[PDB]
Design a protein around this ligand. Structure first.
Ligand SMILES: *[C@@H]1O[C@H](CO)[C@@H](O)[C@H](O)[C@H]1NC(C)=O
Lengths: 48, 45
């Protein structure tokens, strides 16, 4: 029951944590991301 | 001086908006949900 609760809370679909994926470099976000609280950053270097 | 005598008559001499459209930026629409009743079901079983 507890593990099914974990699977329902985090939505562990066939391909990872929903649209979110975790790789070697870091988070890869295949969904929108609206945050309720202020975020922080260090740089924002868009790719050429 | 008659040489620089000038004659002139009538003639016929006849010679703002701002807008930019982006594509999209919608916020979190329909902002309401709860995680208790389903939790109550899966912890009441
Ligand atoms: C009109 O006056 C100017 C200035 O003195 C002179 O250079 C010019 O030759 C004059 N025009 C005629 C047609 O005389």
């Amino acid at each position: 029951a507890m593990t099914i609760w974990i699977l329902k809370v985090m939505n562990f679909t066939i391909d990872g944590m929903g649209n979110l994926r975790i790789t070697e470099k870091g988070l890869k976000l295949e969904g929108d991301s609206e945050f309720l609280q202020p975020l922080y950053a260090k740089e924002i270097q868009s790719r050429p | 001086d008659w040489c620089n005598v000038s004659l002139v008559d009538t003639s016929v001499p006849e010679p703002g908006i701002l807008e930019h459209d982006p594509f999209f930026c919608p916020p979190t629409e329909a902002t309401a949900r709860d995680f208790l009743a389903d939790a109550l079901v899966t912890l009441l079983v």
